[PDB]
Design a protein around this ligand. Structure first.
Ligand SMILES: Nc1ncnc2c1ncn2[C@@H]1O[C@H](COP(=O)(O)O)[C@@H](O)[C@H]1O
Ligand SMILES: Nc1ncnc2c1ncn2[C@@H]1O[C@H](COP(=O)(O)O)[C@@H](O)[C@H]1O
Lengths: 453, 453
């Protein structure tokens, strides 16, 4: 088939470049991978091409430009590559963490757009610099395609002022744009649209609450198909318990500790972002699998941490049920913990039965796959409970495709491929076939989508 | 009658000493008042004796000892006083803001207890110093009676670790006692016990949520008659919108602002505590009456601030309904806004009808008095809604009396006078008679107490 409508997506950190290559016309992920230790000794690419063994190569990358060059060379390599030449790529979608209130939707990057991103860099100091370095690097390597910014905060720009304002001097909002922004926007967008499909409803008629429980974790209250409130804040620090981030805390507690320790703001910021959360409570574990395993061995710090995560999730679900002003149609679990953490889901939902959230423990235990969307609520639960594995890369891919084509707009005025009842994820469909060979009962909880055939 | 069982209560700030004199055997408030501008030029006492006109005297008070001396001289004055001599006072109850996790209940002050309070002073740096100065001052003036500490954090010491732990390095808890403490403890204790009486239930069987909405504001989740969670934190900064405090905020937002402004921790702490909240949002108003009046004049900043307060209350009610694991028996409004702010109560409750909270707008509009406990829910509301004017001074009085007598204990093992169905507040009963002359319909919403006669 025609193989020339390919989209590259990139997510660049201070030390890494993650990539995916998507063939739009064949609706297929051709490859994904990561360059690690960028700007450091020992830079290395791990490249996973469809249908092939993992490829690993150490090659120095003192800059993000070297990392993007290594990716392109690997993608076009005759033996390990997946595209014939670099011109197969027709657009690049870049993750940008923070758009302030200057960006409500994805954009094609221009010099003026880059200047505007510099005006908001101070809002996302731990993330935006490397995101922008990745844009600048890829523009040098792939100069003849549009480079697009898909912005983690943009989804949440529908929040009303009563949700996004902090109770702080109004001058801090007016002069420094201090307000709630929220993150995980591409995940919430994708999962909100999938939830609407599963419910058989137009998005604008849906009222749902989504928990993106990854290493970073946040919740979104979706009212009439739009973000109404979300748990992260000005920065990704606020809200739920996370792997290494504190989430919610008395704003004065960091001062008490700074006085006690001698720490200064940037290193209190790093303690709250890199030494807190599950790692802080347990003293050693970041991954929820390790917390759950240690709890099962008797580790009281892990048992506490597990329960703190559960309790804060319960409180946020209750808060956002209140904020909706009505019973939600559904709650949604996504990201790694949401998709695999059956014990977290059980403990959360069992504490919410008086709010209409009735899990079926048998269904919940089966939902331990990335390859299917499932319904784990009891048949008569007032509120449906869905596990919807996310697809942030697809949002980035489709935004870049639609910006290149000229049809992209904000989601209240634009229709995504994955809003179709007949949308399929080819790689996940193949993985599901394998999952069903080992656990045939999983088929009983896969969602039944109205209008699909 | 015998007039010699008198208890003095004191609440000392950096610049003030508030006092009340309670005749225990005659069950009557003899006087209350305040010395203002203590340690400052222009110190002045305002003294309100039962049945007399307000008395005001300027008299210099360079120390809290001078202020306590001025109070005692005023109380024993032949013309404006209320007691024959200082030895009529048999005990003194002092407000202490922060007890850390070292105090679970009220105590008679000894030198060793004072040393223990110094170990926790760093947890309540804006409040405990003046509280302790007041104890030391009153011990000099009234050396022959017990001085008792009634501690704002103690009520909340029943919280379980899953509620009180922050997701921070465990060393900060272990080395610096960093955890959630909560405040308004005397108000929650009193109102929780009154709610149990009104419900006709033993306290240990009650599950209620109390909003103490004063200039400072916090909420308490009372599970089986004990605090389970509360909205203030390590310090009084966390949680609800307040007159000048921010309440909840991304812990990283103060760093973004400090970088932007040059402010240092103590002055960021003061901005968040003294220039935020309603004052920060509106730019000029602290008192909810001014916010509501300005909203009614069209002030968009006041309208925003009103709505932010309402929305955060809704979220906390939803969070604490979730945390209870069951429908609450009742929600309770108290303190000045809770007792008079009918518009706040209406807006909060109308957004919670799907959680069983159904206000009756006619009843709500009548509940604008400090002199009665009322029920403002619709007759068939799943969750009762009570307005219970608080009485922090009575808790302080009774704790001091019971410590002096030797019968005091933590509230799960001790019975207060105001747990009787037949408990009466004499001054409020007289004020209610006057309220009913002007608004006879108020009588229709006064609570009907099981077993009262
Ligand atoms: N099987 C599992 N059970 C529980 N948590 C998991 C599992 N697999 C991955 N995770 C969590 O998912 C996180 C990654 O999620 P994500 O941010 O969606 O990639 C990891 O840091 C783990 O905490
Ligand atoms: N009539 C009223 N309506 C609304 N709020 C009031 C009213 N009277 C007092 N308040 C609020 O109550 C606060 C004092 O409450 P408290 O801390 O309980 O003394 C004031 O700062 C006002 O914001």
């Amino acid at each position: 088939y025609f193989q020339g409508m390919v989209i590259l997506t990139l997510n660049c950190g201070s030390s890494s470049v993650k990539y995916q290559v998507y063939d739009w016309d064949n609706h297929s992920v051709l490859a994904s991978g990561v360059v690690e230790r960028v700007t450091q000794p020992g830079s290395v690419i791990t490249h996973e091409a469809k249908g092939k063994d993992k490829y690993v190569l150490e090659s120095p990358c003192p800059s993000h430009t070297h990392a993007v060059e290594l990716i392109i060379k690997t993608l076009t390599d005759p033996s390990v590559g997946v595209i014939t030449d670099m011109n197969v790529i027709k657009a690049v979608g870049h993750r940008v963490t923070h758009g302030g209130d200057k960006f409500i939707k994805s954009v094609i990057v221009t010099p003026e757009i880059l200047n505007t991103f510099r005006e908001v860099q101070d809002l996302g100091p731990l993330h935006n610099p490397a995101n922008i370095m990745g844009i600048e690097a890829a523009q040098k390597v792939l100069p003849n395609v549009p480079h697009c910014a898909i912005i983690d905060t943009a989804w949440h720009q529908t929040m009303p002022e009563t949700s996004f304002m902090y109770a702080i001097p109004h001058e801090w909002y007016e002069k420094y744009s201090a307000r709630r922004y929220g993150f995980h926007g591409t995940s919430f967008l994708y999962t909100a649209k999938r939830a609407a499909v599963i419910l058989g409803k137009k998005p604008e008629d849906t009222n749902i609450i989504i928990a993106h429980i990854g290493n970073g974790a946040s919740m979104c209250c979706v009212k009439q198909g739009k973000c109404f409130d979300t748990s992260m804040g000005l920065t990704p620090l606020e809200g739920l318990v996370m792997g290494t981030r504190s989430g919610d805390c008395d704003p004065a507690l960091p001062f008490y500790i700074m006085r006690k320790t001698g720490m200064t703001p940037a290193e209190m910021d790093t303690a709250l972002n890199k030494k807190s959360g599950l790692l802080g409570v347990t003293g050693q574990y970041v991954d929820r699998r390790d917390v759950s395993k240690a709890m099962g061995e008797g580790d009281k710090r892990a048992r506490l941490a597990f329960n703190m995560e559960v309790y804060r999730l319960q409180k946020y679900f209750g808060a956002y049920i209140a904020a909706l002003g009505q019973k939600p149609d559904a709650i949604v679990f996504t990201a790694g913990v949401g998709e695999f953490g059956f014990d977290t889901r059980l403990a959360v939902c069992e504490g919410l039965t008086h709010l209409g959230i009735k899990i079926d423990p048998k269904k919940n235990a089966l939902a331990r796959t990335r390859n299917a969307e499932t319904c784990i609520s009891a048949d008569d639960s007032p509120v449906k409970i869905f596990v919807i594995p996310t697809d942030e890369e697809l949002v980035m891919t489709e935004d870049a495709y639609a910006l290149m084509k000229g049809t992209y707009d904000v989601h209240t005025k634009f229709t995504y491929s994955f809003q179709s009842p007949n949308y399929v994820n080819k790689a996940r469909a193949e993985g599901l076939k394998k999952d069903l060979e080992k656990k045939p009962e999983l088929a009983s909880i896969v969602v039944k989508i109205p209008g699909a055939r």
